Motif scaffolding. Structure first.
Motif, PDB file in Angstrom:
ATOM      1  N   UNK A  36       2.158   0.393  -8.419  1.00  0.00           N
ATOM      2  CA  UNK A  36       3.067   1.203  -9.030  1.00  0.00           C
ATOM      3  C   UNK A  36       2.270   2.440  -9.795  1.00  0.00           C
ATOM      4  N   UNK A  37       1.189   2.753  -9.326  1.00  0.00           N
ATOM      5  CA  UNK A  37       0.752   4.105  -9.956  1.00  0.00           C
ATOM      6  C   UNK A  37       0.335   4.904  -8.760  1.00  0.00           C
ATOM      7  N   UNK A  38       0.120   6.223  -9.157  1.00  0.00           N
ATOM      8  CA  UNK A  38      -0.364   7.267  -8.020  1.00  0.00           C
ATOM      9  C   UNK A  38      -1.755   6.929  -7.683  1.00  0.00           C
ATOM     10  N   UNK A  39      -2.126   7.216  -6.415  1.00  0.00           N
ATOM     11  CA  UNK A  39      -3.622   6.892  -6.132  1.00  0.00           C
ATOM     12  C   UNK A  39      -4.523   7.900  -6.594  1.00  0.00           C
ATOM     13  N   UNK A  40      -5.421   7.536  -7.257  1.00  0.00           N
ATOM     14  CA  UNK A  40      -6.178   8.692  -7.740  1.00  0.00           C
ATOM     15  C   UNK A  40      -6.979   9.590  -6.607  1.00  0.00           C
ATOM     16  N   UNK A  41      -7.247  10.686  -6.828  1.00  0.00           N
ATOM     17  CA  UNK A  41      -7.287  11.730  -5.686  1.00  0.00           C
ATOM     18  C   UNK A  41      -8.757  11.364  -5.157  1.00  0.00           C
TER      19      UNK A  41
END
Lengths: 233, 204, 245, 251, 236, 241, 243, 238
Positions: free
Chosen positions: H97-102
């Motif tokens: 439930x978090x954006x994937x770190x770049x």
């Protein structure tokens, strides 16, 4: 790492219609140590030479005359580790036959199955043909059998034959010495003489391996028995 | 319950130099008879026969698959199969289905090729072989057949005495079983000839 | 056909030459010598000894990790010759095969059986074209209860054999001739005599006097069947005894 | 890798040809002669025995003639172990048909199944083709007595009289000249086979141990397949020699 | 000669050899022309009949992908069959899942995703062994209006106002550039397409030598009958 | 004559030339060094800055493959990254199966065998990278292993891989690293790295530093900014004479 | 598991394996199909008559279903594989759809199979071309041609195999509505086209006829000889009366 | 030669030629520039038209609300990689439930694209990517290559004639960090213009701009949304 073997044949037809890889496997066989098989009236003798390249080798460690079942014996000419592969496969095939039919496999049936394996290696993907010829002896229905199986997968039934070095001269000697009605002792003498024709140096009870198949079964001769036979010659 | 779905009875008996194998002829589904000439005894050689009791579908399937394997065997080896080898082949075929078994219990009667020594055996549905020297039975009336055969069988019977003994055993045993009968077929195997007979039987 | 004849891809993959040879297997045998080392194994009446050449050119190399002696089980030891990574893969395979044999059959694998298993595995490489054979040779020592000490050697061709004594590596021909001379004049070989024979064979074919850090020694005895690698103190004691005579 | 060592067995040539199939046919042309002749009361195979050597043990049933089921038999020319593979496949196919339909397989269907296996090796898989040509003789309730011939390419055809193997073209010329359609009997067919084998085996004289003859006939609604005994072939060769001598005396 | 390199080998210039060769193969195809106007998209293909005995109606170089999408093909038509079948399946899948018509661009994207899915190793059995030898013109009407897309065997698809593919695509493209203006009508588009096809076709252009189809807002994909074809061609 | 194209082909001399060509790929990369002192291991990498457009720490050649194990690489960076993933997988699987931290010798053996598996077949290519694994524990001590493209794994007191590894090894030999601690080794490592760099051939480079030992409680980590700056100043001073 | 790419593009945009399969087709015996008003006629040359061969076993014309039949040129064994696959497809189509196939449907299936074999790993293309004739449920006569590449077209009349260029030239010069007004005229057209390339004047001709609602019919040699005699009689009449 | 056909064949110099040829594939594509300030990451892509009547090919793709990419090289390989990246981002949002770190996404890309460089019969991806992202660590510009190596960058340009853009970025890299969004986009536009032929100029037809930021989800500006960024550009200095 990738465990996939090649899927294309390495043995193909030449423009003259020959499979040259099988002929080269036969050349490997023809460079092997001499082997002799003689089918007497009451048994078969398989005699091979095992002249080690040094006295440091333990003669008793490795064997060239091998039992397949209690009634079937094997010897070869050619490349030894290929022979070990085929010995293991023949023992497994004989056991599977016994598991299905609960009787020991007839010699001809086992020869057919082993020859089928050799043909598979003449046609399947990414492999070379076996570089050995097999001499197979057996006793079935009160009858001796002697077969030769070639690297192509073709097998023949023989009354007496020779493989390996000087096998043409060995065949000539056999056909001018062999006769029917021969007994197992005289066949053993003839097989040892055929080995002696192509042997180099002194033949001792350790330089050669002898196996016999009769109604009692197949067995390797102990070096003491071979020494007795050599003394008789 | 499943083995009794179609009924049926097979029996083999040993003579002095001969064998006998007999079967009832009814094909029926539970209480209803459908036909009266269902084949339960199949030849597997000149002097070798196998009788199958149990589910009729498995009777036919096992007979056909055994014929498949036997034909292949006799082509690969240029000889006729021996009765012991046939028994081992049947046992292997049945045990291949150890957990999904065919619902048939075979009976084998024959003479040794080149020896002509009588051989009889029976197998259970998963292929456990049982060789006897007097008689084997299989089917839905094995208790009655055991009574008849244990009472009537004698050693070293000539083929005519063997025929009478196996005939009386089969007839009186299937007369006492509801879902077997409608005729009996007997094969007498000698070394020089095979005699096939159908017995006069009750049809109720 | 003609001597040294070639046709097609017989020099690149394990297929037969016109003479029936497998050139890739011969090239693997040369790969053994590429390592530049030599090892000798000698069988006594109650012991088997393996002595291998140990070379550590630079002091930056942790010497304790530079070994060609391995233990396959408690009672089976081996010396590897040839390419180091191939050798270590073969050692791992041998350890796995031994453990599995014990697990399946309930007793320790005999030395000849382990050698035969490794040899079968390598014959497979001699017959299949997509992979190269390993460029290493394995010498195994152990104690069989029935037959005494055992020295077995398996090679890249898939050939294996039992030996009274054997050698592997660069100077293995000279070593074999020396061992032939020693075994012809057969006298009862005690543990000390077996160790001295191995060490003197290596020292005479390498034409150098040894030091305890220049060689590696492993032994199995009937009294102590467990495979054990001699420390530098034991090796120096043996070397002193050999030097005084 | 694969690409540089691949022989490319199953690809077309620039002329539209399949080279491996043609080379397998060359192998066939090398092998021993097999002849097939169909008569009104049966059919026969006559094969040259190439395993001739005094030290060879007497063959069990026949060197080159294989029974396939109760009604069919075949003879092979080419690579022997490939022929063993193919004959086992044929026996399996015939028994599969028998299991499925509880009737013997018609001859053409058996030939067609084996030829489909051969064609599959010619088209995909990168394997070399089977180096075997086959002659089939059989009887079925649809077409009676039948003779068939199949090639490594997977082509097959039915024949009245045909030959494969060594000198097969001269044998085919002999058959074209001498075969009489709709009038052959097994006796005249056997005589024709002996004469054809006499011509084809020009180097080696016809002796009963150099040839194997099998006949397929019908008796009492059963099919009988029999390899002739050595004395029967000796008598046939004697009869042929007498015929030749008398034809010379007339001329 | 042709088996020295694998099908997925780059040239020293950064191009896949097989893709370049397929591009070359497309230059041997018959000429197809698509023109996108505000009133619809028109597609026109030369049939290139070789013999009088051949039935020209059996040549289908323009096919309906969906009621609102048509496709003209050039190059090796047998290769285009599987791509067109995939396009039809994708449009019907989109209708099944979302109860709406797929846009022309998403259909073209789905078809272009198949262009480079070829190889020898690391593939399922029967997977594509080579690139497709086709160039496609997708003409459709979606919510964004009428659109024309070009797809090539490299898997690149581009929106186009007017484009020619096939053997004479260079001269036909130059003619398209002078003829085409943004406010062109569909009748003018059809007439200019037929004029350019007549210019570049080796044979005389009649109602049987060509296929012509249109997609319009509110009218489904419509393949011009030969009477309509003669109505248009009568004044050229 | 066509013997150098596959790792499944032996040359007539008994050599596998594809593995040697992979080793050549390693010999062209920049230098990384590892030094094992009495209480830890210190890794120093000369990371060449090819473009000023790059950030600091881009294309780092030092990896944490386990809490206690660090990795210094040279050669093809993508190959090195895949090998670092392999090493991480091995360490994690070992912890899951046997319930403790993988010993460095065992991890080195496992990864070296994985590397060797790529030197046998024509279907794959040997890795074009070599690397060092460094670890410290109270039970096992400090350990420094090096693995090359052939798959050979050896333990070292000091090691250099890359373009200038012979000169770096010569510099390392002049050290009494067996009695030193990590604090002064870090300065020595930085000095050696600054010595072996060629300013004419290569313009600019960052100095990557990491260590594991009793100083870090047996945890491999980047050397802190203070120590790194002190070491760089000392190395620059040592360059001037 | 053999996954080689056999059919690949050449630098000029060609698929050499497909071209070589076409060259294999060009070496096959000539086959001619003519589509008439109420009849479709197939005719195949026999390159040689062995005089010992069972004719029934080497027929180049075979029925795919009741309403569909085909002749072929090229490799006989590839043709056998393709024919069996088409027969299975026709039966499955009769099952899943309660009607027989149209000629175009089975033609499409055959063409797509051939195309699949030009673009899949580990196999070469089929080396045959097919002429497929039949009648649809509407009673329309249909004639189609497929080639190894996988392309198929519909024809009024066509020829494949060796010497097909001259036979196609003859058919273009000769096929007319008047020349197919009756069944006999259509058959004579097929035999005349075959006579442009065959030797021995009609003994090397196998001819098959499909009429509407009727099964495939094979002309026995007597009918072929009668038609050939009619054709030669017409030749003599035209020559003498016009000259 | 014998060393330049297979990705599994090492050359005697320690190089792999197929990887370098895939690099050439990237170099053939049209230029694209990526740069970042303290708060924003900008991709500016020069689009190319095959013909005068064709639309300019899409160069900037959506990956996730915080990640976008610009492509050079084979477009179909770029679509493969973009689908993979989108699937990774969706997996991260589904599981954590978090954006994937770049940088984790870029590591996944490198791992995926390294594999075909070692296996026989495979080929490298022939696409170079500029990845603009924003996460907890701020803005990020990443460059991925066919060799499977990737670089964290202050600014970068890839494609044809990208060396001039890289020189301009070298010159103004010190300025980039404190620029506001409009100034940063204008710096990127000038760098992209440095790769143009003399006759060609930046127009609303051949310029595409992707922006991501702290409060700004990744957004693409194509034809008419580009004009506010083009307005105010000084003429080319020459």
């Amino acid at each position: 790492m990738a465990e996939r073997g090649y899927s294309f044949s390495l043995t193909t037809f030449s423009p003259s219609g020959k499979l040259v890889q099988i002929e080269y496997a036969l050349a490997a066989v023809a460079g092997g140590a001499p082997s002799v098989g003689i089918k007497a009236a009451n048994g078969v003798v398989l005699a091979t030479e095992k002249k080690q390249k040094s006295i440091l080798y333990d003669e008793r460690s490795v064997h060239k005359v091998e039992p397949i079942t209690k009634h079937i014996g094997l010897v070869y000419s050619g490349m030894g580790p290929d022979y070990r592969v085929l010995v293991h496969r023949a023992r497994k095939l004989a056991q599977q036959y016994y598991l299905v039919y609960q009787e020991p496999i007839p010699t001809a049936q086992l020869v057919q199955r082993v020859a089928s394996v050799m043909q598979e290696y003449t046609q399947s993907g990414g492999v070379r043909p076996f570089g050995v010829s097999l001499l197979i002896c057996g006793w079935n229905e009160g009858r001796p059998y002697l077969f030769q199986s070639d690297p192509s997968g073709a097998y023949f039934a023989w009354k007496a034959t020779a493989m390996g070095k000087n096998y043409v001269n060995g065949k000539t000697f056999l056909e001018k010495r062999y006769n029917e009605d021969l007994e197992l002792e005289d066949a053993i003498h003839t097989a040892i003489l055929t080995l002696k024709e192509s042997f180099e140096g002194q033949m001792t009870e350790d330089n050669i391996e002898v196996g016999i198949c009769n109604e009692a079964g197949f067995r390797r001769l102990t070096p003491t028995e071979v020494k007795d036979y050599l003394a008789a010659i | 319950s499943i083995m009794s779905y179609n009924g049926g009875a097979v029996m083999a008996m040993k003579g002095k130099n001969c064998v006998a194998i007999a079967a009832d002829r009814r094909f029926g589904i539970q209480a209803q008879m459908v036909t009266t000439d269902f084949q339960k005894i199949f030849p597997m050689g000149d002097r070798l026969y196998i009788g199958l009791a149990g589910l009729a579908t498995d009777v036919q399937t096992v007979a056909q698959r055994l014929k498949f394997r036997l034909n292949l065997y006799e082509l690969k080896e240029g000889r006729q199969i021996k009765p012991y080898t046939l028994m081992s082949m049947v046992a292997n075929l049945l045990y291949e289905k150890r957990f999904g078994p065919y619902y048939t219990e075979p009976v084998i009667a024959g003479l040794d090729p080149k020896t002509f020594k009588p051989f009889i055996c029976s197998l259970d549905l998963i292929g456990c072989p049982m060789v006897t020297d007097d008689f084997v039975v299989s089917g839905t009336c094995t208790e009655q057949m055991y009574g008849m055969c244990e009472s009537l069988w004698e050693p070293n019977m000539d083929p005519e005495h063997l025929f009478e003994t196996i005939s009386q055993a089969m007839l009186n045993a299937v007369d006492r079983d509801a879902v077997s009968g409608m005729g009996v077929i007997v094969h007498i195997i000698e070394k020089d000839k095979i005699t096939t007979r159908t017995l006069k039987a009750r049809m109720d | 056909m003609s001597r040294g004849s070639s046709a097609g891809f017989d020099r690149h993959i394990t297929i037969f030459s016109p003479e029936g040879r497998l050139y890739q297997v011969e090239y693997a045998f040369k790969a053994i010598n590429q390592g530049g080392l030599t090892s000798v194994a000698v069988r006594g009446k109650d012991c088997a000894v393996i002595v291998t050449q140990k070379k550590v050119p630079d002091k930056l190399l942790d010497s304790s990790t530079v070994t060609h002696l391995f233990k396959i089980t408690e009672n089976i030891g081996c010396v590897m010759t040839g390419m180091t990574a191939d050798s270590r893969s073969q050692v791992q395979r041998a350890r796995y095969e031994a453990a599995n044999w014990k697990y399946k059959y309930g007793y320790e694998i005999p030395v000849d059986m382990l050698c035969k298993r490794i040899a079968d595995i390598s014959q497979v490489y001699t017959q299949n074209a997509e992979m190269r054979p390993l460029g290493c040779c394995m010498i195994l020592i152990g104690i069989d209860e029935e037959q005494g000490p055992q020295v077995y050697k398996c090679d890249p061709a898939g050939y294996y054999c039992g030996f009274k004594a054997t050698a592997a590596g660069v100077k293995q021909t000279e070593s074999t001739s020396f061992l032939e001379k020693k075994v012809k004049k057969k006298f009862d070989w005690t543990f000390e005599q077996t160790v001295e024979t191995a060490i003197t064979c290596l020292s005479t074919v390498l034409s150098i006097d040894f030091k305890p850090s220049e060689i590696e020694v492993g032994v199995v005895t009937v009294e102590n069947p467990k495979f054990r690698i001699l420390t530098e103190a034991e090796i120096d004691a043996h070397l002193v005894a050999l030097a005084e005579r | 890798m694969s690409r540089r060592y691949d022989s490319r067995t199953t690809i077309f040539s620039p002329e539209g040809r399949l080279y491996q199939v043609e080379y397998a046919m060359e192998a066939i042309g090398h092998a021993g002669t097999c002849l097939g002749i169909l008569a009104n009361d049966g059919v026969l195979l006559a094969a040259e025995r190439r395993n001739i050597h005094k030290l060879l043990d007497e063959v069990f049933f026949s060197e080159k003639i294989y029974k396939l089921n109760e009604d069919m038999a075949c003879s092979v020319a080419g690579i022997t172990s490939d022929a063993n593979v193919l004959t086992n496949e044929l026996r399996l196919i015939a028994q599969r048909y028998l299991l499925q339909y509880q009737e013997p397989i018609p001859c053409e269907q058996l030939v067609t199944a084996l030829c489909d296996i051969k064609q599959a090796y010619t088209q995909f898989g990168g394997k070399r083709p089977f180096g075997v040509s086959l002659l089939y003789i059989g009887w079925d309730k649809h077409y009676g007595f039948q003779l068939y011939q199949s090639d490594p390419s997977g082509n097959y055809g039915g024949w009245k009289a045909t030959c494969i193997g060594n000198n097969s073209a001269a044998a085919v010329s002999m058959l074209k000249q001498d075969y009489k359609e709709g009038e052959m009997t097994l006796k005249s067919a056997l005589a024709l086979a002996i004469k054809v084998l006499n011509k084809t085996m020009d180097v080696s004289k016809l002796s009963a141990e150099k040839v194997e003859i099998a006949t397929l006939t019908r008796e009492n609604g059963k099919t009988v397949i029999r390899v002739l005994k050595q004395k029967e072939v000796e008598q046939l060769i004697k009869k042929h020699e007498e015929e030749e001598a008398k034809a010379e005396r007339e001329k | 000669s042709e088996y020295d390199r694998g099908v997925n080998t780059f040239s020293p210039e950064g191009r896949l050899f097989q893709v370049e060769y397929a591009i070359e193969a497309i230059k041997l195809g018959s000429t197809a022309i698509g023109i996108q106007t505000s009133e619809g998209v028109c597609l026109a293909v030369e049939k290139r009949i070789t013999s009088p005995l051949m039935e020209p109606s059996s040549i289908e170089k323009i096919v309906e992908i969906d009621a609102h999408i048509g496709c003209a093909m050039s190059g090796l038509i047998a290769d285009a069959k599987t791509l067109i079948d995939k396009a039809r399946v994708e449009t019907q899948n989109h209708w099944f899942t979302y109860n709406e018509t797929m846009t022309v661009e998403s259909v073209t994207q789905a078809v272009s995703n198949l262009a480079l899915q070829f190889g020898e190793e690391d593939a399922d059995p029967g997977a594509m062994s080579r690139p497709f030898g086709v160039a496609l013109l997708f003409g459709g009407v979606d919510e964004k209006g009428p659109q024309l897309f070009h797809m090539d065997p490299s898997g690149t698809f581009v929106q186009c106002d007017a484009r020619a593919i096939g053997s004479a695509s260079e001269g036909a493209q130059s003619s398209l550039q002078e003829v085409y203006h943004k406010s062109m009508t569909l009748k003018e588009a059809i007439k200019s397409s037929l004029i350019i096809l007549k210019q570049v076709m080796e044979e005389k252009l009649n109602a049987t030598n060509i296929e012509l189809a249109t997609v319009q807002p509110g009218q489904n994909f419509h393949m011009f009958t030969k009477e309509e074809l003669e109505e248009v061609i009568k004044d050229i | 004559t066509g013997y150098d194209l596959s790792a499944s082909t032996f040359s007539p001399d008994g050599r596998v030339f594809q593995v040697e060509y992979a080793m050549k790929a390693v010999e062209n990369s920049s230098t990384a060094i590892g030094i094992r002192c009495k209480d830890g291991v210190v890794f120093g990498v000369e990371k060449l800055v090819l473009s000023k457009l790059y950030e600091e720490g881009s294309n780092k050649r030092l990896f944490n493959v386990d809490r206690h194990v660090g990795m210094a690489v040279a050669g093809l960076l993508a190959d090195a990254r895949s090998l670092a993933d392999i090493a991480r997988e091995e360490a994690s699987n070992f912890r899951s199966n046997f319930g403790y931290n993988i010993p460095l010798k065992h991890l080195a053996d496992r990864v070296a065998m994985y590397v060797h598996a790529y030197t046998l077949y024509s279907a794959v290519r040997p890795f074009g990278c070599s690397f060092m694994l460094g670890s410290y524990s109270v039970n096992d001590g400090a350990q420094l292993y090096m693995i090359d493209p052939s798959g050979v794994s050896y333990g070292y007191w000091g090691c250099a891989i890359g373009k200038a590894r012979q000169a770096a090894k010569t510099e390392i030999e002049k050290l009494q690293m067996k009695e030193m601690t990590c604090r002064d080794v870090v300065k020595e490592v930085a000095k050696i790295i600054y010595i072996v760099h060629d300013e004419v051939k290569d313009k600019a480079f960052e100095l990557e530093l990491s260590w594991v030992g009793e100083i870090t409680n047996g945890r491999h980590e980047i050397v802190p900014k203070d120590v790194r700056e002190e070491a760089e100043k000392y190395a620059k001073e040592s360059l001037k004479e | 598991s053999y996954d080689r790419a056999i059919t690949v593009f050449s630098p000029d945009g060609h698929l050499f394996q497909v071209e070589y399969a076409q060259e294999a087709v060009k070496k096959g015996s000539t086959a001619v199909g003519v589509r008439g008003k109420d009849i479709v006629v197939l005719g195949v040359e026999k390159k040689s008559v062995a005089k010992l061969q069972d004719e029934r076993t080497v027929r180049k014309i075979c029925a795919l279903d009741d309403n569909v039949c085909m002749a072929f040129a090229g490799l006989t064994a590839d043709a056998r594989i393709v024919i069996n696959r088409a027969r299975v497809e026709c039966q499955s189509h009769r099952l899943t759809v309660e009607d027989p196939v149209t000629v175009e449907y089975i033609t499409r299936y055959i063409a797509s199979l051939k195309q699949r074999y030009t673009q899949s790993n580990g196999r070469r293309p089929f080396g045959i071309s097919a002429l497929i004739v039949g009648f649809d449920f509407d009673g329309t006569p249909r004639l189609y041609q497929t080639d190894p590449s996988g392309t198929y077209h519909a024809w009024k009349a066509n020829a494949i195999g060796r010497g097909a260029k001259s036979v196609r030239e003859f058919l273009e010069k000769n096929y007319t509505d008047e020349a197919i007004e009756t069944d006999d005229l259509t058959i004579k057209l097929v035999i005349k086209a075959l006579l442009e390339v065959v030797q021995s004047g009609g003994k090397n001709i196998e001819l098959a006829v499909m009429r509407r609602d009727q099964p495939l019919k094979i002309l026995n040699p007597e009918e072929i000889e009668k038609y050939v005699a009619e054709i030669e009689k017409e030749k003599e009449e035209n020559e003498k009366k016009k000259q | 030669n014998q060393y330049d056909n297979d990705v599994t064949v090492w050359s005697p110099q320690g190089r792999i030629h197929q990887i370098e040829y895939a690099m050439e594939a990237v170099k053939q594509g049209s230029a694209t520039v990526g740069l970042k300030s303290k708060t924003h990451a900008v991709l500016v892509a020069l689009k190319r038209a095959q013909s005068e009547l064709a639309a300019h090919q899409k160069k900037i793709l959506h990956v996730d609300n915080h990640i976008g990419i610009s492509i050079a090289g084979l477009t179909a390989d770029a679509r493969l990689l973009c689908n993979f990246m989108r699937q990774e981002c969706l997996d991260s949002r589904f599981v954590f439930d978090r954006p994937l770190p770049v940088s984790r996404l870029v590591s996944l890309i490198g791992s995926k694209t390294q594999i075909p460089t070692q296996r026989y019969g495979r080929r490298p991806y022939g696409v170079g990517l500029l990845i603009a992202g924003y996460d907890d660590m701020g803005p990020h510009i990443f460059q991925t290559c066919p060799s499977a190596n990737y670089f964290d960058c202050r600014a970068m340009s890839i494609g044809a004639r990208s060396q001039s853009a890289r020189t301009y970025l070298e010159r103004h890299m010190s300025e980039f960090m404190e620029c506001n969004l409009n100034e940063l986009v204008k710096h990127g536009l000038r760098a992209l213009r440095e790769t143009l032929p003399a006759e060609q100029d930046l127009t609303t037809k051949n310029v595409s701009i992707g922006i991501v930021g702290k409060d700004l989800e990744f957004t693409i500006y194509d034809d008419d949304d580009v004009s506010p960024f083009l307005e105010g550009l000084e003429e080319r200095p020459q």
